[PDB]
Amino acid sequence: TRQFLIYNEDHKRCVDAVSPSAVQTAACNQDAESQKFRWVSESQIMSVAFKLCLGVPSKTDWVAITLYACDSKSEFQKWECKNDTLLGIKGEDLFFNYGNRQEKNIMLYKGSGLWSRWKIYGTTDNLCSRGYEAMYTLLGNANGATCAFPFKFENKWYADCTSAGRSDGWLWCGTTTDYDTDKLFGYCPLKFEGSESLWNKDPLTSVSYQINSKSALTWHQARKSCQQQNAELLSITEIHEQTYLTGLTSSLTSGLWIGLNSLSFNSGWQWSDRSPFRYLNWLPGSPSAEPGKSCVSLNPGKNAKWENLECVQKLGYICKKGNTTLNSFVIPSDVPTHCPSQWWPYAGHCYKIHRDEKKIQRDALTTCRKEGGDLTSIHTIEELDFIISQLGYEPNDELWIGLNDIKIQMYFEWSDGTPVTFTKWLRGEPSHENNRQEDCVVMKGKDGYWADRGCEWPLGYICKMKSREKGCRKGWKKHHFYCYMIGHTLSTFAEANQTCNNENAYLTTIEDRYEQAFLTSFVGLRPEKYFWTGLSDIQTKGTFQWTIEEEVRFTHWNSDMPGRKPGCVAMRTGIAGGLWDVLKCDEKAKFVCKHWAH
């Protein structure tokens, strides 16, 4: 219930609703309910005191805005922020204005003056900052449908979640505009006395679980229901987790949604909360090869096992609220690098790829231990991208790694005893585990992602052990034909382009998949949040070019980049793995220079 007041600085008077046919301005008051407003849709603004939306008689010049009955299809009630702080009707350039022509009622107007721009009281942001978000109910008889604001309960209009009609303060809402007629309702996912009883808390791991067997949402809807509760769709990472949930869902049979999905087209199966997919528990015949089934459901009737279905089915879902973090692996840039011959260092470990004599996994595991190491374990995306970039890895390689489930089937563990905190499966992997007794994992593909197969095939392997200049300058690491540097002075993009040019270099370009992979490992394990690069749209807004004028034949953009956002590109560290974000060029962050060899 994020209500807000609205006023204009050039007059310092808050909009006040007095009558459904008269909306004026009075003295600003935080307690006067007649001045509170909140969005109820992507465009509809509603009053809290009268439970009525703001609209216009018709999209024409100089008409009085008043309180109308809230209607979803009403084109006259849809608003939109334009340019900066201007507030106008969705479709035309008619604005929310007050002050002109001695009219105490706020008027729709054509003039773009300061009398038509409104901010939120107590802040400096426009009205499109908060906005309406779909709120999915819990339990109830409405199958977890979204709240409908406003709704009529016992001939009274309510604007937010209410405890009326109940004697236990349980907040609830009506999923339809007329509850007295439809009697469809649900409980609001908000903090109230007793809301903790909706979560089941494992006394061991302290992780909390919510089981909504009465709801019936899609996968994308179920994820949004858990996200809005500071949670996420269920992820099962241990045998104890699968066992604890089997007891909770022992009395249920209706299928429930979990976080396991394959929606990412480049990778394989993955959890919604980015947890490592190392524990498998598919039903027989699952996962199926149907191209449309990309979301996994937990079937409590068939012994809590998993099956993949279409992401559009309406089933229950399980939320997972927990604070458990796998590890940090942050290195305050510091690590030893005493590696033997033919081995290469990274983050305190020595790696080596064996392409010479292809052996099976058990012979590869023995050979790595003969040399004082072990089959490689991978814990970060940075460490994975170091292997493909610096170890002479080729796109058509197939190399063994330490991931296996020889001890317990369907439960992958690292051969070197280290915990499994990271997984990157290939498109369509893991698959066909029921066809064999031991599932060993390999590295193949241009991106070096993983795939599980039989353990009885001669292949290359990658060994890894502890720690016990080159063709260029001192503080410059060398990758392939170039040498790169990390500036330690937090500077802007302008200041960064100078320091790189000061050292006869330049902000690093990114030409292929592996130079990006190297740069992903060259930074990303350091506590800094962003690292600059060469891409920017200063030459021509909308088009990106390097600062040394080379062809831009590679793109490593983030989730929602770039498009509308103008600025300077910078790589993101941590779990993102060097993805390109667009930031304001006046922001201060470290950078990476680049220079040719010798």
mmCIF file of all heavy atoms in Angstrom, residues 432-462:
data_model
loop_
_atom_site.group_PDB
_atom_site.id
_atom_site.type_symbol
_atom_site.label_atom_id
_atom_site.label_comp_id
_atom_site.label_asym_id
_atom_site.label_seq_id
_atom_site.Cartn_x
_atom_site.Cartn_y
_atom_site.Cartn_z
ATOM 1 N N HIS A 432 19.429 -37.943 -20.297
ATOM 2 C CA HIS A 432 19.668 -39.380 -20.449
ATOM 3 C C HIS A 432 20.500 -39.942 -19.295
ATOM 4 O O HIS A 432 21.458 -40.691 -19.494
ATOM 5 C CB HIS A 432 20.320 -39.685 -21.800
ATOM 6 C CG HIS A 432 19.563 -39.141 -22.972
ATOM 7 N ND1 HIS A 432 20.140 -38.958 -24.211
ATOM 8 C CD2 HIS A 432 18.276 -38.738 -23.093
ATOM 9 C CE1 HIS A 432 19.240 -38.466 -25.044
ATOM 10 N NE2 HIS A 432 18.101 -38.324 -24.392
ATOM 11 N N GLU A 433 20.124 -39.569 -18.070
ATOM 12 C CA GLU A 433 20.789 -40.117 -16.893
ATOM 13 C C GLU A 433 20.316 -41.529 -16.570
ATOM 14 O O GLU A 433 21.100 -42.338 -16.062
ATOM 15 C CB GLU A 433 20.570 -39.210 -15.680
ATOM 16 C CG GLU A 433 21.239 -37.851 -15.771
ATOM 17 C CD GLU A 433 20.536 -36.917 -16.732
ATOM 18 O OE1 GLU A 433 19.289 -36.944 -16.790
ATOM 19 O OE2 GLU A 433 21.233 -36.159 -17.436
ATOM 20 N N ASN A 434 19.049 -41.842 -16.852
ATOM 21 C CA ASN A 434 18.511 -43.166 -16.564
ATOM 22 C C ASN A 434 19.087 -44.253 -17.462
ATOM 23 O O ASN A 434 18.888 -45.438 -17.175
ATOM 24 C CB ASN A 434 16.985 -43.151 -16.691
ATOM 25 C CG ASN A 434 16.300 -42.547 -15.476
ATOM 26 O OD1 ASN A 434 16.611 -42.894 -14.336
ATOM 27 N ND2 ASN A 434 15.359 -41.640 -15.716
ATOM 28 N N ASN A 435 19.792 -43.885 -18.529
ATOM 29 C CA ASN A 435 20.357 -44.847 -19.465
ATOM 30 C C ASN A 435 21.719 -45.378 -19.033
ATOM 31 O O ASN A 435 22.289 -46.217 -19.736
ATOM 32 C CB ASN A 435 20.473 -44.216 -20.858
ATOM 33 C CG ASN A 435 19.809 -45.052 -21.935
ATOM 34 O OD1 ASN A 435 19.597 -46.253 -21.763
ATOM 35 N ND2 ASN A 435 19.477 -44.418 -23.055
ATOM 36 N N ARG A 436 22.252 -44.916 -17.904
ATOM 37 C CA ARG A 436 23.559 -45.358 -17.441
ATOM 38 C C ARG A 436 23.596 -45.322 -15.921
ATOM 39 O O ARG A 436 22.689 -44.803 -15.265
ATOM 40 C CB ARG A 436 24.681 -44.501 -18.041
ATOM 41 C CG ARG A 436 24.320 -43.036 -18.212
ATOM 42 C CD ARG A 436 25.479 -42.249 -18.805
ATOM 43 N NE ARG A 436 25.033 -41.279 -19.802
ATOM 44 C CZ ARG A 436 24.517 -40.089 -19.513
ATOM 45 N NH1 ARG A 436 24.378 -39.712 -18.249
ATOM 46 N NH2 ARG A 436 24.139 -39.273 -20.488
ATOM 47 N N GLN A 437 24.672 -45.883 -15.363
ATOM 48 C CA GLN A 437 24.826 -45.991 -13.919
ATOM 49 C C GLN A 437 25.764 -44.945 -13.336
ATOM 50 O O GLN A 437 25.653 -44.633 -12.145
ATOM 51 C CB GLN A 437 25.355 -47.382 -13.543
ATOM 52 C CG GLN A 437 24.624 -48.536 -14.204
ATOM 53 C CD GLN A 437 24.354 -49.677 -13.241
ATOM 54 O OE1 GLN A 437 24.970 -49.767 -12.180
ATOM 55 N NE2 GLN A 437 23.423 -50.552 -13.606
ATOM 56 N N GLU A 438 26.680 -44.405 -14.135
ATOM 57 C CA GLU A 438 27.593 -43.357 -13.701
ATOM 58 C C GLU A 438 27.562 -42.232 -14.723
ATOM 59 O O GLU A 438 27.762 -42.472 -15.917
ATOM 60 C CB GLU A 438 29.020 -43.895 -13.536
ATOM 61 C CG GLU A 438 29.115 -45.145 -12.671
ATOM 62 C CD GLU A 438 30.459 -45.840 -12.784
ATOM 63 O OE1 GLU A 438 31.414 -45.215 -13.295
ATOM 64 O OE2 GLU A 438 30.561 -47.012 -12.364
ATOM 65 N N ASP A 439 27.308 -41.013 -14.256
ATOM 66 C CA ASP A 439 27.194 -39.845 -15.123
ATOM 67 C C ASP A 439 28.395 -38.940 -14.883
ATOM 68 O O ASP A 439 28.480 -38.272 -13.847
ATOM 69 C CB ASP A 439 25.886 -39.097 -14.865
ATOM 70 C CG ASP A 439 24.669 -39.994 -14.974
ATOM 71 O OD1 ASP A 439 24.441 -40.558 -16.064
ATOM 72 O OD2 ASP A 439 23.935 -40.131 -13.971
ATOM 73 N N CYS A 440 29.318 -38.918 -15.839
ATOM 74 C CA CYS A 440 30.451 -38.005 -15.810
ATOM 75 C C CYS A 440 30.170 -36.815 -16.719
ATOM 76 O O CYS A 440 29.428 -36.921 -17.698
ATOM 77 C CB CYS A 440 31.737 -38.711 -16.245
ATOM 78 S SG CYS A 440 32.300 -40.008 -15.117
ATOM 79 N N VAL A 441 30.776 -35.677 -16.388
ATOM 80 C CA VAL A 441 30.493 -34.408 -17.050
ATOM 81 C C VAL A 441 31.718 -33.975 -17.843
ATOM 82 O O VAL A 441 32.858 -34.179 -17.409
ATOM 83 C CB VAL A 441 30.087 -33.330 -16.027
ATOM 84 C CG1 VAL A 441 29.649 -32.057 -16.733
ATOM 85 C CG2 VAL A 441 28.979 -33.853 -15.123
ATOM 86 N N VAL A 442 31.477 -33.380 -19.013
ATOM 87 C CA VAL A 442 32.535 -32.923 -19.904
ATOM 88 C C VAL A 442 32.322 -31.446 -20.212
ATOM 89 O O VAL A 442 31.297 -30.853 -19.871
ATOM 90 C CB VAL A 442 32.595 -33.735 -21.216
ATOM 91 C CG1 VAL A 442 32.838 -35.202 -20.925
ATOM 92 C CG2 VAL A 442 31.315 -33.548 -22.016
ATOM 93 N N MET A 443 33.316 -30.858 -20.870
ATOM 94 C CA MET A 443 33.224 -29.491 -21.367
ATOM 95 C C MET A 443 33.272 -29.476 -22.886
ATOM 96 O O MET A 443 34.236 -29.949 -23.484
ATOM 97 C CB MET A 443 34.357 -28.627 -20.811
ATOM 98 C CG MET A 443 34.051 -27.948 -19.494
ATOM 99 S SD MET A 443 35.474 -26.716 -18.987
ATOM 100 C CE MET A 443 35.516 -25.619 -20.597
ATOM 101 N N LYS A 444 32.233 -28.930 -23.512
ATOM 102 C CA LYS A 444 32.199 -28.824 -24.962
ATOM 103 C C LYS A 444 31.356 -27.624 -25.356
ATOM 104 O O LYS A 444 30.546 -27.122 -24.571
ATOM 105 C CB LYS A 444 31.660 -30.106 -25.611
ATOM 106 C CG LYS A 444 30.212 -30.423 -25.285
ATOM 107 C CD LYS A 444 29.792 -31.737 -25.928
ATOM 108 C CE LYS A 444 28.307 -32.002 -25.741
ATOM 109 N NZ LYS A 444 27.906 -33.318 -26.314
ATOM 110 N N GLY A 445 31.560 -27.165 -26.579
ATOM 111 C CA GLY A 445 30.853 -26.014 -27.094
ATOM 112 C C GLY A 445 31.743 -24.783 -27.161
ATOM 113 O O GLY A 445 32.800 -24.699 -26.529
ATOM 114 N N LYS A 446 31.292 -23.808 -27.955
ATOM 115 C CA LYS A 446 32.044 -22.567 -28.107
ATOM 116 C C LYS A 446 32.173 -21.823 -26.785
ATOM 117 O O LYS A 446 33.200 -21.185 -26.532
ATOM 118 C CB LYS A 446 31.377 -21.675 -29.155
ATOM 119 C CG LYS A 446 31.366 -22.261 -30.560
ATOM 120 C CD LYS A 446 30.720 -21.306 -31.553
ATOM 121 C CE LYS A 446 31.468 -19.983 -31.619
ATOM 122 N NZ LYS A 446 32.842 -20.138 -32.175
ATOM 123 N N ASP A 447 31.153 -21.897 -25.934
ATOM 124 C CA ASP A 447 31.147 -21.199 -24.655
ATOM 125 C C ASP A 447 31.721 -22.035 -23.519
ATOM 126 O O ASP A 447 31.831 -21.533 -22.396
ATOM 127 C CB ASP A 447 29.723 -20.761 -24.301
ATOM 128 C CG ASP A 447 29.088 -19.915 -25.385
ATOM 129 O OD1 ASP A 447 29.762 -18.991 -25.890
ATOM 130 O OD2 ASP A 447 27.917 -20.172 -25.735
ATOM 131 N N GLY A 448 32.083 -23.288 -23.779
ATOM 132 C CA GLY A 448 32.646 -24.129 -22.740
ATOM 133 C C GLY A 448 31.651 -24.610 -21.709
ATOM 134 O O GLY A 448 32.036 -24.880 -20.566
ATOM 135 N N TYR A 449 30.379 -24.726 -22.077
ATOM 136 C CA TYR A 449 29.378 -25.211 -21.143
ATOM 137 C C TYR A 449 29.481 -26.727 -20.987
ATOM 138 O O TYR A 449 30.209 -27.409 -21.713
ATOM 139 C CB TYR A 449 27.980 -24.794 -21.596
ATOM 140 C CG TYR A 449 27.731 -23.308 -21.452
ATOM 141 C CD1 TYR A 449 26.780 -22.661 -22.231
ATOM 142 C CD2 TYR A 449 28.451 -22.553 -20.535
ATOM 143 C CE1 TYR A 449 26.554 -21.304 -22.097
ATOM 144 C CE2 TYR A 449 28.231 -21.197 -20.395
ATOM 145 C CZ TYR A 449 27.283 -20.578 -21.177
ATOM 146 O OH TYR A 449 27.064 -19.226 -21.038
ATOM 147 N N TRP A 450 28.744 -27.253 -20.016
ATOM 148 C CA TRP A 450 28.917 -28.627 -19.571
ATOM 149 C C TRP A 450 27.841 -29.541 -20.142
ATOM 150 O O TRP A 450 26.765 -29.104 -20.558
ATOM 151 C CB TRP A 450 28.897 -28.710 -18.042
ATOM 152 C CG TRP A 450 29.829 -27.760 -17.356
ATOM 153 C CD1 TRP A 450 30.833 -27.029 -17.928
ATOM 154 C CD2 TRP A 450 29.838 -27.431 -15.964
ATOM 155 N NE1 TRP A 450 31.464 -26.267 -16.976
ATOM 156 C CE2 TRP A 450 30.872 -26.497 -15.761
ATOM 157 C CE3 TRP A 450 29.072 -27.838 -14.868
ATOM 158 C CZ2 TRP A 450 31.159 -25.963 -14.508
ATOM 159 C CZ3 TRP A 450 29.359 -27.307 -13.625
ATOM 160 C CH2 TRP A 450 30.392 -26.379 -13.455
ATOM 161 N N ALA A 451 28.153 -30.835 -20.143
ATOM 162 C CA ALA A 451 27.234 -31.877 -20.570
ATOM 163 C C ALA A 451 27.669 -33.178 -19.915
ATOM 164 O O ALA A 451 28.868 -33.441 -19.795
ATOM 165 C CB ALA A 451 27.214 -32.024 -22.096
ATOM 166 N N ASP A 452 26.699 -33.985 -19.495
ATOM 167 C CA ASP A 452 26.988 -35.251 -18.838
ATOM 168 C C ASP A 452 26.831 -36.401 -19.824
ATOM 169 O O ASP A 452 25.942 -36.386 -20.681
ATOM 170 C CB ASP A 452 26.081 -35.463 -17.621
ATOM 171 C CG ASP A 452 24.628 -35.673 -17.996
ATOM 172 O OD1 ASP A 452 24.158 -35.042 -18.966
ATOM 173 O OD2 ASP A 452 23.955 -36.472 -17.312
ATOM 174 N N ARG A 453 27.708 -37.393 -19.701
ATOM 175 C CA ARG A 453 27.764 -38.507 -20.637
ATOM 176 C C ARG A 453 28.316 -39.724 -19.903
ATOM 177 O O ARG A 453 28.540 -39.691 -18.690
ATOM 178 C CB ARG A 453 28.617 -38.144 -21.858
ATOM 179 C CG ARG A 453 30.009 -37.644 -21.505
ATOM 180 C CD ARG A 453 30.978 -37.824 -22.662
ATOM 181 N NE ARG A 453 31.068 -39.219 -23.088
ATOM 182 C CZ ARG A 453 30.770 -39.645 -24.310
ATOM 183 N NH1 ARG A 453 30.365 -38.785 -25.236
ATOM 184 N NH2 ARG A 453 30.878 -40.932 -24.610
ATOM 185 N N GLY A 454 28.536 -40.804 -20.649
ATOM 186 C CA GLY A 454 29.146 -41.983 -20.067
ATOM 187 C C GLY A 454 30.603 -41.751 -19.715
ATOM 188 O O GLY A 454 31.304 -40.953 -20.339
ATOM 189 N N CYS A 455 31.065 -42.468 -18.695
ATOM 190 C CA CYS A 455 32.416 -42.310 -18.178
ATOM 191 C C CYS A 455 33.438 -43.180 -18.900
ATOM 192 O O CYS A 455 34.612 -43.178 -18.516
ATOM 193 C CB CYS A 455 32.443 -42.627 -16.678
ATOM 194 S SG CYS A 455 31.271 -41.670 -15.679
ATOM 195 N N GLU A 456 33.025 -43.914 -19.933
ATOM 196 C CA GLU A 456 33.904 -44.857 -20.613
ATOM 197 C C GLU A 456 34.176 -44.411 -22.045
ATOM 198 O O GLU A 456 33.837 -45.123 -22.995
ATOM 199 C CB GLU A 456 33.290 -46.260 -20.607
ATOM 200 C CG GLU A 456 32.586 -46.635 -19.309
ATOM 201 C CD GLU A 456 33.540 -47.134 -18.242
ATOM 202 O OE1 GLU A 456 34.746 -47.272 -18.538
ATOM 203 O OE2 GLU A 456 33.083 -47.391 -17.107
ATOM 204 N N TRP A 457 34.793 -43.239 -22.212
ATOM 205 C CA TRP A 457 35.105 -42.734 -23.539
ATOM 206 C C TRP A 457 36.424 -41.976 -23.478
ATOM 207 O O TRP A 457 36.607 -41.151 -22.568
ATOM 208 C CB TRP A 457 34.004 -41.808 -24.057
ATOM 209 C CG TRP A 457 34.044 -41.568 -25.536
ATOM 210 C CD1 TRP A 457 34.818 -40.661 -26.201
ATOM 211 C CD2 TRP A 457 33.232 -42.206 -26.530
ATOM 212 N NE1 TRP A 457 34.562 -40.719 -27.551
ATOM 213 C CE2 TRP A 457 33.589 -41.655 -27.778
ATOM 214 C CE3 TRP A 457 32.247 -43.197 -26.487
ATOM 215 C CZ2 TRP A 457 32.997 -42.063 -28.971
ATOM 216 C CZ3 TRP A 457 31.659 -43.599 -27.671
ATOM 217 C CH2 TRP A 457 32.036 -43.034 -28.896
ATOM 218 N N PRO A 458 37.348 -42.225 -24.406
ATOM 219 C CA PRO A 458 38.631 -41.503 -24.391
ATOM 220 C C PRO A 458 38.429 -40.047 -24.783
ATOM 221 O O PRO A 458 37.982 -39.747 -25.891
ATOM 222 C CB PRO A 458 39.477 -42.255 -25.427
ATOM 223 C CG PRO A 458 38.783 -43.573 -25.621
ATOM 224 C CD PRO A 458 37.328 -43.284 -25.425
ATOM 225 N N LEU A 459 38.773 -39.141 -23.870
ATOM 226 C CA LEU A 459 38.647 -37.713 -24.119
ATOM 227 C C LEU A 459 39.769 -36.981 -23.397
ATOM 228 O O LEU A 459 40.459 -37.542 -22.541
ATOM 229 C CB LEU A 459 37.283 -37.179 -23.664
ATOM 230 C CG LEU A 459 36.066 -37.499 -24.532
ATOM 231 C CD1 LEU A 459 34.785 -37.090 -23.826
ATOM 232 C CD2 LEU A 459 36.182 -36.803 -25.880
ATOM 233 N N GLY A 460 39.945 -35.714 -23.757
ATOM 234 C CA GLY A 460 40.856 -34.857 -23.033
ATOM 235 C C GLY A 460 40.338 -34.542 -21.643
ATOM 236 O O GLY A 460 39.183 -34.792 -21.298
ATOM 237 N N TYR A 461 41.220 -33.982 -20.821
ATOM 238 C CA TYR A 461 40.856 -33.658 -19.450
ATOM 239 C C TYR A 461 41.582 -32.393 -19.020
ATOM 240 O O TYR A 461 42.555 -31.966 -19.648
ATOM 241 C CB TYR A 461 41.161 -34.821 -18.492
ATOM 242 C CG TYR A 461 42.498 -35.502 -18.714
ATOM 243 C CD1 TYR A 461 43.586 -35.225 -17.895
ATOM 244 C CD2 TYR A 461 42.667 -36.435 -19.731
ATOM 245 C CE1 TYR A 461 44.806 -35.851 -18.091
ATOM 246 C CE2 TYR A 461 43.881 -37.061 -19.935
ATOM 247 C CZ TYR A 461 44.947 -36.766 -19.114
ATOM 248 O OH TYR A 461 46.154 -37.393 -19.319
ATOM 249 N N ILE A 462 41.089 -31.795 -17.939
ATOM 250 C CA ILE A 462 41.608 -30.539 -17.410
ATOM 251 C C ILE A 462 41.932 -30.761 -15.940
ATOM 252 O O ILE A 462 41.025 -30.988 -15.129
ATOM 253 C CB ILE A 462 40.614 -29.383 -17.580
ATOM 254 C CG1 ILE A 462 40.160 -29.270 -19.035
ATOM 255 C CG2 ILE A 462 41.234 -28.076 -17.110
ATOM 256 C CD1 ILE A 462 39.124 -28.196 -19.263
#
